[PDB]
Amino acid sequence: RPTFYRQELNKTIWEVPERYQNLSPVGSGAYGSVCAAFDTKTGLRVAVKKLSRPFQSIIHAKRTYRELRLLKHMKHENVIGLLDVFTPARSLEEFNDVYLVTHLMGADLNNIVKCQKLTDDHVQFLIYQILRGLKYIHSADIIHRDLKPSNLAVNEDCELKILDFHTDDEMTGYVATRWYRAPEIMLNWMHYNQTVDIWSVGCIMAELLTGRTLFPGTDHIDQLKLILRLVGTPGAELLKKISSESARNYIQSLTQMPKMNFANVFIGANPLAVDLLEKMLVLDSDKRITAAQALAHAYFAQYHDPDDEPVADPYDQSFESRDLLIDEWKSLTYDEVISFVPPP
Template sequence: MAIAARSRSGFYRQEVNRTVWEVPERYRDLKQIGTGAYGTVCSAWDRRTAAQVAIKKLHRPFQSKLFAKRAYRELRLLKHMRHENVIGLLDVFTAEISLDRFRDFYLVMPFMGTDLGKLMKMEKLTEDRVQFLVYQILKGLKYIHSAGIVHRDLKPGNLAINPDCELKILDFGLARQADAEMTGYVVTRWYRAPEVILNWMHYTQTGKGRPHSGNAVWNVFNLEKSVLSCVAVDIWSAGCIMAEMLLGKPLFKGNDHLDQLREIMKITGTPSPDFVVKLQSQDAKNYIRSLPKVPKKDLHYVFSKASSNAVCVLERMLLLDPECRASASETLELPFFNEFRDIEEETEALPYDQTMDNTDLPLDQWKRHTFTEILTFRPPRDSKGTSL
């Protein structure tokens, strides 16, 4: 009978829902709080900082090149982020001390407690709460976008909130248009920018296969693939989320991608000829031209209970043409946010080096790069300048 290997010095083992977790002694009282395709999350008590944390164990991160690259990218993105409205890394560890035994690793992040989706189900938000939450979303987006990163899948479930109503953006830069999310959960579709849906139409209806990456969104447009163009997908999603906060229900609740587009155009109106000309896909052009002409709705009428300043924000974000949408920085300047604005907090990030994102490496090299990233991690410093 095989004897279980002893844990590395300073680590202990605990079974959580039939999965063995091997974690440092400082983290205690593990309880599963979430699980998904890529990993499981437990809450834990950090004895060193006397605070609750969230620990994510990635699900077999080295089972394939695709999983290994995604795991490496998630680790690097989290290491790069240092902003109060963007989830960052408090710690990263593996119980293995050599590369040849390296199988699993764990990401330690702040514990938030809930997310915006759950919060909206529990209560109707007042406009001042909406102000504060949207302000934080935009500050986080400004930071992420300044690093050259596009979230691509912003939705209420990706916005973590603590009891003080402080918000952090999760899972940024990880979504890919070729992922199952394109045809997966219905909720995700409600926050998709129209250009993403038009791109999906182009690839599925012409039989040309699915888009290869997030940047392929722009293949459907005769647009320059600038970061400014790409980040507009997140601004649309943020507008949809703000609209839902104000209405108490999703603004665009399509049953499928075509229905989603129809729901959007009931509010935005049928696209102008200038917009249609920008479309590269003949299928998308023909589809839009076949739609009955619908005038643009007055958002002041749709959001009759909201203040004029709140509606003004939505008017700048929910524009059909991505080139016309305000950036996160521009939106923050609107009067709606004056009460909460602290310009010193509206910081930008250092550029994120995306060289590796377009690299095709063997599995063992992704594993080696990930192991190196773990070994070179330095924890963030607290307000007193000491390491956590």
């Protein structure tokens, strides 16, 4: 057990191992209760997240367990992983606070690229990295579900990590929280798949190429209309898969529209980029390109290396189907904290 010291930061007492020095709040609340620090043991600049007391309810206790399990699993260059996890508690009975330590990133994709068109070379490299991370995440049967520029963090050499794996209110109106969501998830059409994330990548890629939001809808329905104008209205085949009968019924009220010519939308773009976008932005999720398929697309010829695009170890999510008591989720979480082994 290391020696812990106390400091008052985000209106609360942080008790952390001596190895972490010069704690300073970051993100202005937008990432949770997170402080930047210097890890004297590793020489890394790190982010330390103190969970907002994590066992207040069953829902919150399970969410705490979920986040720790996910972060402990992720071991990939393009995905946020766990450098350390600790608690000042000396026993399960004393256990009430969890601190998570990760790499400190420089900026998110949003505040970097906002309103700006990138060069094709830069788009290739950024999207390649996202796809490389997604191949890894998907190989563990994990779906991100909320990919957008604000949960893509980059450093000075354009090296990228996926992080931050919502309420009805925060998804309402003219909001970036919804602009990158696949239509089947936005409108609860069906049980969705991993390629909900590929839709999101398509939206991000389009925006990097143009400097403009692809589907900046003023509400869910306005957004759907923007989407269907580009990709065309659904055919009978997809309509049958919309298991929601009310959703299915609303779609057939719309005047039919053919898919647009993407070369006339993304004017001047690399033809290979246009081709990839056409394969990502397919309405029927069964027919969307996968992360592994996309990595082998000719657009990434200068970066693709099938021997340097690893997959994840299997990830057991059986706990999701389980209904436990707070103290049980808490004990499971404690076991995961005390069993943590840091990376090389």
